């Protein structure tokens, strides 16, 4: 669980 990971489809 990385809160800085891309949270979008693209």
């Amino acid at each position, epitope marked *: 669980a990385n809160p800085n*990971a891309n949270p*979008n*489809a693209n």
Partner: antibody
Framework: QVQLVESGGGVVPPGRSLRLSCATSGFTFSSYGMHWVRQAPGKGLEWVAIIWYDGSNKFYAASVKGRFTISRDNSKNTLYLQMNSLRVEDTAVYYC??????????????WGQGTLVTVSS | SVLTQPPSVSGAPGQTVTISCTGGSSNIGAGYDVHWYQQLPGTAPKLLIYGNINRPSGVPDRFSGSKSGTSASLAITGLQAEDEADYYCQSYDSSLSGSWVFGGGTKLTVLG
């Protein structure tokens, strides 16, 4: 055409509950992560929470974890913030923001107009 | 604030002002991108600079961002009354549990 329209703010005593809503149009809601950010009157911005586009992940500021739940309804193009056990120090304008991402960190490319939560006894 | 900004800056119309944003080795020093927001009094923040240096197409050419080491900076050339606002830098800090960290904000006064 990108609209983020918030509602649900008002005046509540400490320990009460409020649900904020962020009703979106003008983009494919289900493709985007969304954030809540807050600002105490006269103070700076504080990130509150994020939800993934697909709802796979939710993260919270330490200041609200255990008390607030972020959620979304893709069929209503709507983001929610469930705020339980409100404290006077939760008094703020709450903003929703559409998630964007650059290379090594994220940012908010569109922001709601804000809704004021006043927690007072 | 993980990110340190001057509480206040000012300038006269036509002048250049610079707003600094100082972090550390787990945020800006770690290479996590910096972004900037403009908040006109009584309005929601608006994106001003993203990915350290990029203007959204709607932002005038007077706004620019730079980043070196543990510091970022926003420069505003050709200062206008409309620029009077609070400015926030924003990044991510690997030593904290949130998606975004903010600077404490800088109040820009345009001495008009």
């Amino acid at each position: 055409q990108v609209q983020l329209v918030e509602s649900g703010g008002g005046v509540v005593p400490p320990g009460r509950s409020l649900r904020l809503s962020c009703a979106t149009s003008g983009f494919t809601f289900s493709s985007y992560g969304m954030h809540w950010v807050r600002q105490a009157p006269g103070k700076g911005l504080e990130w509150v929470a994020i939800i993934w586009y697909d709802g796979s992940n939710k993260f919270y500021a330490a200041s609200v974890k255990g008390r607030f739940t972020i959620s979304r309804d893709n069929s209503k193009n709507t983001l929610y913030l469930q705020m339980n056990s409100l404290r006077v120090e939760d008094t703020a304008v709450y903003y929703c923001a559409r998630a964007a991402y650059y290379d090594t960190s994220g940012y908010g490319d569109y922001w709601g107009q804000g809704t004021l939560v006043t927690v007072s006894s | 604030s993980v990110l340190t900004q001057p509480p206040s800056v000012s300038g006269a119309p036509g002048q250049t002002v610079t707003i600094s944003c100082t972090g550390g080795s787990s945020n800006i020093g770690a290479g996590y991108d910096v972004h900037w927001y403009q908040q006109l009094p009584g309005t929601a923040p608006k994106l001003l600079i993203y990915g350290n240096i990029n203007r959204p197409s709607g932002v005038p050419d007077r706004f620019s961002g730079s980043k070196s080491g543990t510091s970022a900076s926003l420069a505003i050339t050709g200062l206008q009354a409309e620029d009077e606002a609070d400015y926030y830098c924003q990044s991510y800090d690997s030593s904290l549990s949130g998606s975004w960290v903010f600077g404490g904000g800088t109040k820009l006064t345009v001495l008009g």
